[PDB]
Amino acid sequence: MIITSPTEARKDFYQLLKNVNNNHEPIYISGNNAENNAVIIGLEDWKSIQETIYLEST
Amino acid sequence: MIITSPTEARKDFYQLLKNVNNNHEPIYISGNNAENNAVIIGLEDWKSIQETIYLE
Amino acid sequence: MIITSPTEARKDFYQLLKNVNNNHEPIYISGNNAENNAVIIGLEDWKSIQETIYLESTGTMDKVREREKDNSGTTNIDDIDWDNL
Amino acid sequence: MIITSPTEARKDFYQLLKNVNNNHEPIYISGNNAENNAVIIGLEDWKSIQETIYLESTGTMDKVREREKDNSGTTNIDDIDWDN
């Protein structure tokens, strides 16, 4: 569980995107507004997740 | 699960203690003081987690 | 699907975080350094994905799919004899 | 072992959150209804716990525990031939 506010995430946005691919851990964005609540996944991990749900359904 | 700040958690603190048990969900406390982040979980769920850690 | 560069994503970051929660569609981040590509998903939508991945990772969904196809029958949950099983 | 009521935990909430992260010992909350009892755990300690139970649910820890006492020998990671 890595949690950071949107403001703190935007200050180190590029390092965040590298970390989510090198560490393979989702990063949860959460601040004062619930409309910003989101998760950041690496693309390779995201494609692996999409294939697991889709391949075993077929 | 739920992510919230300690200020928001304190306004609904009693409902928080019921939800972690009724929903068996961890409620993460994350505010501006990023080094004081914590999680609140139900006691019965915590007992099961303890038994899982020490099962062989 | 919505695709954007990391630099463009940083300019409209607060507006992207509100799009994944309203449009319920992931935002793909693709830039010149493709090894740093990522995707933004709303938290409520991600919980269903993480729950599904957990049940797949434990082999539970394999049991669920296999049990859906068998002809073992059905027992009402009130008729369960807990003292023998 | 720190056990406290829900009302006093609410009044000391910000200090309890700093306590679990400095002492690495959880705080227990016990009130009039035992079914609402909760535990406060530091996030970094919770990461070790979640990773452990995840590797337990997948059956990995049982394999790890069995491989620790199987007497099968060890091979250097450089002596691994990926073509075979």
Added chain:
Amino acid sequence: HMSNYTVKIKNSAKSDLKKIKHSYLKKSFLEIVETLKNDPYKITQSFEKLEPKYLERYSRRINHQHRVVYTVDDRNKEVLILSAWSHYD
């Protein structure tokens, strides 16, 4: 003896109930059943619509580790429990 929904379980999934009993999770499992008898779509117990959505499989938490995976027949008002144990063993 009467409720909004009939909760049942696949007989091959009854093996999970024995692991629930010996893990002292029977009490938490029966709380899921009572909600499934009244409203299997109630936003409680970490209710979740599993992926892919069109297969219409649902999940509720017995605790942090185990789930009740089930489908719902809306015509006959029946809940079919397909799994009650989320560990590999």
Added chain:
Amino acid sequence: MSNYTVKIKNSAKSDLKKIKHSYLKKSFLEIVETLKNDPYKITQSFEKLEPKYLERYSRRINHQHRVVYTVDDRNKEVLILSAWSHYD
């Protein structure tokens, strides 16, 4: 050469067969390079498993699979016990 000697259990080499056929070999090899230099390095989602007195550690190959290992700090030897977190 390197700070630590990285070994894998013989009964765990079948995990490397699945690592090879899942295109995770590059990710797994980046982990074993870190294990040669510093197995306690705060990278790759390094985590100390519970119970802490058994001193088991894990690093993420991807979102699903982990490298589970122990460290012989006396002899500077890392023993990989698992490289595939799925039952098959």
Added chain:
DNA sequence: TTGACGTACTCAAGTGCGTACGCTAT
């Protein structure tokens, strides 16, 4: 030029934190 990248400004809006009150249940 470009995206990548670290860094910066600004003011409205919110949190952090201790502390408190009125009321019910005990």
Added chain:
DNA sequence: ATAGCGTACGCACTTGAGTACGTCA
């Protein structure tokens, strides 16, 4: 005669949000 609750206060401290600049490859 105290916890269990929902709710509030005051102010220092931070986030939120759009927007910008200078440097680099």
